[PDB]
Design a protein around this ligand. Structure first.
Ligand code: ATP
Ligand code: ATP
Ligand code: ADP
Ligand code: ADP
Ligand code: MG
Ligand code: MG
Lengths: 242, 242, 242, 241
């Protein structure tokens, strides 16, 4: 599994960002992380992607410390899919390819677009796979941009997967084909998601409630809601409505 | 109606690809777009398919511009492109189900296979509707493949139908597909073709002859054939069989 | 040595883009490509970038055909630096390595940023080398955005260099820290510019005038201006006052 | 004049880093910004160089905002030196001629080294202005490296001079010509400091105390140390260096 035992972190000297954090996320599972803004949620992903180090306490992968045990070509194991004010500049092929691991066949890309849900909008597309996108190239509706991100993912083929939602779009119940592409992408790996969609929380195989740099809750929704007043109240106030 | 109201277009500054284009398409009227490769036919379709912008003028649906609709009604609901050459494999249910937006019914699916005239190969492979069809088992053939692409169509139910025909005509079962299934598809709505078959043109309710970026003919085949030596040449040499 | 012997090219059937094109780019030298827009100048670069194949000719490097070398190795020997639309998002460590092999650390990033004449202002930036750019992060000017690109180039360290100007801010008489950071990039490399700057040509070791698909002239500026009447037209009109 | 009439800022959105900040920079002199680490000192500088755009209030110059030109701004501004590790420009010319202008002269370069109190260093360097001071030849120990730098700063004769100090390598001589040069540089400009040195704040013309993203002290040192039990605490414990 991907365990994180007793992690501590502070970006600077002002305040402590993360305080003694412990969690686990195993294969063919999804683990959500929820909580107020400024909790430390993004920060876990940052350390997990190795942008920074835990000031104290290890992060292990399958027994071995991720850090400087698996050189920073550890990124081929990880994959991160999120969205906001973005543009992808270039050819679809080009886009699906900074990774020296994937794309060596146009047919392999097609296998990926199928899984990501695109052999339909990439066939009913101009020079097909060889089209320049965006930047005075083609027009792609937001949802398509994301499915193409899920596409690169599929080809990059990560062992661990990390997600995050910013814009409402699919409000948890809104349910869309970008989501069906997520569901496909999550299947063979270890998913970690910073939850903002209510449904995303209910289905999570394990939830970690994060209140200002600390983990309050540690199990399933069902249980947690009866057990935690502050969690339950978070679910009411901010999550669903506020 | 769909009115291509004066459309000037170009990708780069040198080649001014489309000059004053002006076509209008109605219900149950099949319009075609025939011409030498370079004509700009697909380019018309790319602007109909909204991948690009018109430089001068507008394409107007029911008087109200197309550029007064969102990114996801025009594309999926009204914007359609026969899928035929998509080349699919998975399950019969899954190929037919590919990115529609809802949950389905075997009874809705049978309503569409009868309508597509595909109810037999289906009624024979005995996990029928859930059967495997592909690089795995219960193989597929060019004929069947296309009738399902046409059936998908029915599920989507489009108001505007777009085709780009094939320079690949499979003998005999081509009608059981092309001339049955296309027939019923094109039968209730506004159809637009890029004709690479003579069959089409004859039946078309109005042809638009595109030679090097401009339209040179606006009439039915027999009206144009007698009046345009280059059109009759085109149809006798480049669209023709034998 | 980069020699392109007898090249012909067409994307579509509606025009042949390049016709019987031959040229040589030798080391530590600067070759320019001028001529009206449409001559095929961006296309040659695309051909060298291997985005496309010569339909008739043969591009060669040091005696070995570039189609042999294999896609990856080629793209690593080459490097292309152009101007704005090109906004960068992420870090100054991330925008400088992405798609490179490992190591040599922030120290190696300093030396390059020095070669690009960035360093000073880069040190003056918040988390320097760990600074976020784009919408998420900080403000950067056009003049600084590209210097980082010249920097990335120094680091990717090509053998062959390509570039061009598609905007008026560096008129040819308008010289800055950018055009001078470019001059250092041009150093030990086989450079080739699609000239647009009036001076660039007056310095270029060999010029290739391109008119609608063909190389009309080949030699130093002075030489071509007396000998070739039509070159003079490009030089005094399209260039000087448009 | 540089005035920051009411500045509120927040990089993230859950922590209002700066809440109502207001300072007024003035002619030919110094102004300090002492305070603890999480204060927002560097962040004010990061706003003075337009790296980030505020949430409330504008930073005024001679009355007007800063909507002028990223160029005029970057120009009038100044980055200092020591943070400039060792630059292998392998030529005195090149080191002082980093990203600078149109062209410069010898007569000019030295005019500056005489102003940076650095003329003689160079006389003992083979092929004078053309000399290497890198990993490859004529290694300077550091005191001179940082002064050659004030010299660069002396080139564009800026209106606004921004600083940031630390690690007082007490080769007091380094601070002797470092102070003399820095003096010659500050003397006659609108200077803004994030002082980590006592010497600086003692004779600053007005200081500001920044505790947790707010100003809490606003006057000459002689007054602050007597009116603010937390200022004097900061200055004797963490600022002594
Ligand atoms: N670069 C930074 N330097 C210093 N402190 C930072 C930095 N980035 C974030 N922080 C601090 O960490 C806390 C924030 O972020 P985190 O990004 O951990 O929040 P979240 O709670 O994970 O929210 P979100 O996922 O929406 O960003 C903030 O409130 C801020 O004080
Ligand atoms: N993808 C393409 N498909 C078809 N034709 C193209 C394509 N790209 C460029 N062309 C054609 O080649 C000619 C253009 O480009 P090239 O890019 O070769 O021009 P240049 O001579 O480099 O001009 P500029 O850079 O100013 O556009 C144009 O007239 C255009 O019709
Ligand atoms: N990606 C492109 N960039 C520039 N021009 C292009 C591009 N694609 C096609 N064209 C131009 O469009 C015209 C061909 O239009 P197209 O729709 O492909 O023709 P048709 O479908 O009738 O064969 C040609 O002049 C061709 O060079
Ligand atoms: N990049 C950043 N993103 C979010 N917050 C930051 C960032 N950099 C600094 N901060 C916040 O700004 C405050 C410190 O401001 P800063 O200018 O670094 O202080 P000082 O200059 O006094 O050391 C802290 O609360 C810190 O969390
Ligand atoms: Mg084409
Ligand atoms: Mg700081």
């Amino acid at each position: 599994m991907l365990s994180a035992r007793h992690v501590d972190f502070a970006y600077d000297d002002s305040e402590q960002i993360l305080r003694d954090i412990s969690f686990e996320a195993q294969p063919n599972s999804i683990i959500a992380f929820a909580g107020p803004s400024g909790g430390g949620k993004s920060t876990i992903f940052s350390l997990l992607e190795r942008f920074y180090q835990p000031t104290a306490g290890e992060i292990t992968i399958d027994g071995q410390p991720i850090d400087n045990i698996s050189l920073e070509n550890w990124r081929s194991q990880i994959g991160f899919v999120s969205q906001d004010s973005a543009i992808m500049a270039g050819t679809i092929r080009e886009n699906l390819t900074y990774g020296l691991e994937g794309d060596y066949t146009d047919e392999d890309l097609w296998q990926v677009l199928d899984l990501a849900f695109a052999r339909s909008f990439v066939e009913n597309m101009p020079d097909q796979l060889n089209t320049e996108v965006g930047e005075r190239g083609v027009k792609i509706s937001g949802g398509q941009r994301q499915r193409l991100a899920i596409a690169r993912a599929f080809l990059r083929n990560p062992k661990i997967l990390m997600l995050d939602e910013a814009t409402a779009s699919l409000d948890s119940e809104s349910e869309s084909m970008v989501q069906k592409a997520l569901d496909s992408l999550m299947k063979g790996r270890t998913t970690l998601v910073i939850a903002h969609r209510l449904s995303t929380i209910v289905d999570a195989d394990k939830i970690y409630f994060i209140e200002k740099g600390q983990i309050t809750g540690s199990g399933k929704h069902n249980e947690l809601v009866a057990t935690h007043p502050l969690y339950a109240k978070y679910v009411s106030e901010q999550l669903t409505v506020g």
